[PDB]
Design a protein around this ligand. Structure first.
Ligand SMILES: Nc1ncnc2c1ncn2[C@@H]1O[C@H](CNS(=O)(=O)NCCCCC[C@@H]2SC[C@@H]3NC(=O)N[C@@H]32)[C@@H](O)[C@H]1O
Length: 260
């Protein structure tokens, strides 16, 4: 751990803005802060006060009260992760389509690190590698916006955050460069968001091609603490998980997947 700190230099905010903001780029604003409770909470607070957060990026070197799905947490230590939130205007898109945005986010994350490295997307949005959770995605709503949060373990050690975690460094990526990764990440997200906004079928085909969950036997932990065990067959037009339970189709809009 003490050694991993020597592989955690800070992000160059100036250089990242030079790469990501400007003509042709959807990103309107990027800031790197030293510390916050939750980048999602922060962009949601901005929007609740009237700010236009469409194409706004907030990166945090450290995150002390990270949020997960379904009232869970997200652990981080300083400079170990890429922790960021982006604002996406969604009010132009019918509400039944908004869950795709979270699927698209996980695809963006997976694609931006895949070349550096059992690996793929667990439905809905989380990125697994060698069975460990490599990145967490969390989208929340602040009309007319969705705030899309990513926490990507770059040099983060499982013993620092969670027993089931993995990171680029634990997958053997030598000394991962968070500036390079964050630029690849935010360029991938931009295209994926544009794809979502325009109902591009390539989004669904690329998600299916990256899914670890489709085809596998799963147990799905439903909101409310009921479990269903079936075989995940597909996602539908709303990105809902289609389960085969001994012949019957069960379509799940929210849940925690365990692969069996
Ligand atoms: N470091 C870490 N590595 C891997 N596993 C980790 C971890 N820490 C905790 N766990 C486990 O993962 C479970 C939660 N799983 S989840 O389904 O809720 N996934 C959704 C995750 C949300 C993404 C966070 C982003 S960061 C930018 C923005 N700002 C926020 O506040 N949120 C978003 C927990 O209970 C622990 O067991």
């Amino acid at each position: 751990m003490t050694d991993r700190d020597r592989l955690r230099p800070p992000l160059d905010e100036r250089s990242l803005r030079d790469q990501l903001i400007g003509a042709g780029s959807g990103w309107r604003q990027l800031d790197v802060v030293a510390q916050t409770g939750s980048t999602n909470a922060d962009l949601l607070a901005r929007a609740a006060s009237g700010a236009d957060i469409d194409g706004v990026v907030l990166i945090a070197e450290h995150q002390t009260a990270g949020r997960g799905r379904h009232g869970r947490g997200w652990a981080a230590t300083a400079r170990a992760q890429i922790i960021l939130s982006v604002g996406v205007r969604v009010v132009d898109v019918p509400v039944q389509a908004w869950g795709w945005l979270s699927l698209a986010a996980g695809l963006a994350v997976l694609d931006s690190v895949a070349p550096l490295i059992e690996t793929g997307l667990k439905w809905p949005n989380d990125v697994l590698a060698r069975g460990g959770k490599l990145a967490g995605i969390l989208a929340e709503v602040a009309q007319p916006f969705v705030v899309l949060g990513v926490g990507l373990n770059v040099t983060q050690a499982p013993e620092e955050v969670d027993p089931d975690a993995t990171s680029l460094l634990d997958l053997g990526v030598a000394a991962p460069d968070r500036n390079r990764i964050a630029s690849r990440l935010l360029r991938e997200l931009e295209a994926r968001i544009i794809q979502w906004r325009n109902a591009n079928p390539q989004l669904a085909a690329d998600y299916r091609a990256r899914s670890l969950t489709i085809g596998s036997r799963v147990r799905v932990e439903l909101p409310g603490g009921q479990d269903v065990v079936g075989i995940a067959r597909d996602i539908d037009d709303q990105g809902r998980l289609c389960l085969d339970v001994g012949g019957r189709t069960v379509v799940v809009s929210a849940g925690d997947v365990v692969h069996l």
